[PDB]
Design goal:
61% of the residues lie in helices and 0% in strands. It is an all-alpha fold. The termini are far apart. Belongs to the TMEM14 family.
């Protein structure tokens, strides 16, 4: 049993695909280290998520997102957000794979 998209909407889908092309693109040839690029991802990162649903793009929509996640998340505390399926990409999964690879072969050092 599989549904179109658990959550990842179409639009997003397009953003992820194009984001992958560009991502892997620069991140590829360049590999990484992008100080400005990465920094751009951080800024636009939070602004993207928050802005997308917080306060930046349309006061109404955002508001709709405030009440939406307000109650949805309200049920719980701290944050409580999906993170158990690793069907698509895998947050905890992939992440774990990242950290693993990090400790494996990559400039990394535990938070001493």
């Amino acid at each position: 049993m599989q549904d179109t998209s658990s959550v990842v909407p179409l639009h997003w889908f397009g953003f992820g695909y194009a984001a992958l092309v560009a991502s892997g693109g620069i991140i590829g040839y360049v590999k990484a280290g992008s100080v400005p690029s990465l920094a751009a991802g951080l800024l636009f990162g939070s602004l993207a998520g928050l802005g997308a649903y917080q306060l930046s793009q349309d006061p109404r929509n955002v508001w709709v997102f405030l009440a939406t996640s307000g109650t949805l998340a309200g049920i719980m505390g701290m944050r409580f957000y999906h993170s158990g399926k690793f069907m698509p990409a895998g947050l905890i999964a992939g992440a774990s794979l990242l950290m693993v690879a990090k400790v494996g072969v990559s400039m990394f050092n535990r938070p001493h």
